[PDB]
A paper describes a structure:
GECIs are prominent tools to monitor [Ca2+] in defined cells and intra-cellular compartments.
To directly observe the chromophore orientation and the structure and extent of cp-mRuby/CaM packing interactions, both of which assisted GCaMP engineering, we solved the crystal structure of the early RCaMP variant RCaMP1a. RCaMP1a was crystallized in the Ca2+-bound form and its structure was determined to 2.1 Å resolution by molecular replacement. Although the mRuby circular permutation was based on GCaMP, large differences between RCaMP and GCaMP in both the orientation of, and interface between, the CaM/M13 complex and the cpFP domain can be seen. Strikingly, unlike GCaMP, there is no large opening in the side of the FP β-barrel created by the circular permutation of the mRuby domain in Ca2+-bound RCaMP; the termini of cp-mRuby cross close to one another and produce minimal disruption to the β-barrel. In contrast with the chromophore in the structure of mRuby crystallized at pH 8.5, the RCaMP structure (crystallized at pH 7.5) shows the (4-hydroxybenzylidene)-imidazol-5-one moiety of the chromophore to be a cis-isomer. Closer inspection of the electron density map for the RCaMP chromophore revealed a discontinuity between Phe213 and Met214, which forms part of the chromophore (Met214-Tyr215-Gly216). This imine hydrolysis results in a discontinuity in the polypeptide backbone of RCaMP, also observed by SDS-PAGE of purified protein samples.
Residue numbers in the entry:
A (entry chain A): 217 to 369, 376 to 440
B (entry chain B): 35 to 213
Write the structure that this text describes.
């Protein structure tokens, strides 16, 4: 019932603007236990009154689950969001993945990032991962879906550190760090690599140890 | 301004997180223009007896029926909602629910940061009437309801009756956000 959302002045209100004609919507809902519901809706305005028509089709709900057994107790509120700063950080990240600069993360690009962060994953997995957040099912991750995935996100930092520390001596040198950032598709000067080392290097030995790495990475 | 070198570490940290497993549940609704149309991505949590949740997500494309006239399109924004059931009769054949919803600014997007244009057809109080029908796991049903609210404050109440196929052999909650 989208017409009853308080929109601040500075955000255009798609719903209120659509009158007198109104609007429609189509929706696909997936529950984590497998149930799926498709909905189509029309919102119209007739003689000063709002009029809604909805068609729903749900399937695959487990017979023993809480929905079919009527063991539900209402919805949590929906209040989490990202900040403007976070969205701008996540856009910078996204481009590491979006190396063709097109707007979409193909399974090819996800594998190359995972490869240069040292991962060894199949299509069997690169399609599982992409399906966990492919809202619309085209088969790639665009920026809004990347946002959702990010918002939803020790042993793995340890792995990252082992990958950065190519020679295994316990310290990431400038040369090691340049190699990973380059492979990630970062465009940065050698000065900029050193500036990253300097930012991380609290004990001032010219290199990044594990604990220093953890602090930058978390 | 965030320091350049720190931005790099942050984004490297994000890339490591993005490829990692182990996803939380989240409760969020993000709106993003696509076309000339408005898309929403919503993650909600349905409370279950014993205190767990069933996590659910949906993608919605909203389309205007105004075919002539410039509609100002928003960019990316979120909406906070609280939808609460106020009453029910027996076996959930009658349900009263209310919702409070507010869109949230998270940066200049799409249509500038100037709003579209106030629509004199949407007054401070508006009524609604609804018909919803369909099936779940093959069980057919039809509900009707009525309600009202304050569109500029984001508040509304709906009284809904299950007029065919009742009592539903499934939880009414799964229909809550569909009217
Ligand atoms: Ca791409
Ligand atoms: Ca997609
Ligand atoms: Ca080393
Ligand atoms: Ca050091």
């Amino acid at each position: 019932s989208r017409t009853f959302i308080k929109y601040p002045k500075g955000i255009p209100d798609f719903f209120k603007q659509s009158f007198p004609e109104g609007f429609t919507w189509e929706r696909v809902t997936r529950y984590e236990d497998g149930g799926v519901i498709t909905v189509m809706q029309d919102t119209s305005l007739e003689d000063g009154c709002l009029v809604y028509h909805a068609q729903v089709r749900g399937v695959n709900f487990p017979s023993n689950g809480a929905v079919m057994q009527k063991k539900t107790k209402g919805w949590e509120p929906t209040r989490d969001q990202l900040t403007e700063e976070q969205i701008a950080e996540f856009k910078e990240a996204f481009s590491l993945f979006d190396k063709d600069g097109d707007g979409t993360i193909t399974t090819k690009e996800l594998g190359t990032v995972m490869r240069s962060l040292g991962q060894n994953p199949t299509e069997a997995e690169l399609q599982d991962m992409i399906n966990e957040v492919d809202a619309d099912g085209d088969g790639t991750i665009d920026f809004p879906e990347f946002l959702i995935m990010m918002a939803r996100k020790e042993e793995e930092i340890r792995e990252a550190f082992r990958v950065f520390d190519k020679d295994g001596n316990g310290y990431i040198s400038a040369a090691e760090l340049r190699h990973v950032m380059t492979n990630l598709g970062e465009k940065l000067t050698d000065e900029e690599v050193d500036e990253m080392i300097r930012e991380a290097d609290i004990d001032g030995d010219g290199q990044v140890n594990y604990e220093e790495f953890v602090q930058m990475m978390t | 301004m965030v320091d350049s070198s720190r931005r790099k570490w942050n984004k490297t940290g994000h890339a490591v997180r993005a490829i990692g497993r182990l996803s939380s549940a989240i409760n969020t609704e993000m709106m993003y223009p696509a076309d000339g149309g408005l898309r929403g991505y919503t993650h909600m949590a349905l409370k279950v007896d014993g205190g767990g949740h069933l996590s659910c997500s949906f993608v919605t494309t909203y389309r205007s029926k105004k075919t002539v006239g410039n509609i100002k399109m928003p960019g990316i924004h979120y909406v906070s909602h609280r939808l609460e059931r106020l009453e029910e009769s027996d076996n959930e054949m009658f349900v009263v629910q209310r919702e409070h919803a507010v869109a949230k600014f998270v940066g200049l997007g799409g249509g500038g940061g100037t709003g579209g244009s106030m629509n004199s057809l949407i007054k401070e109080n508006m009524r609604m009437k609804v018909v919803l029908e369909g099936s779940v796991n093959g069980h057919q049903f039809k509900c009707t309801g009525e309600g009202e609210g304050n569109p500029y404050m984001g508040t509304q109440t709906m009284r809904i009756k299950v007029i065919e196929g009742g009592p539903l052999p499934f939880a009414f909650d799964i229909l809550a956000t569909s009217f």
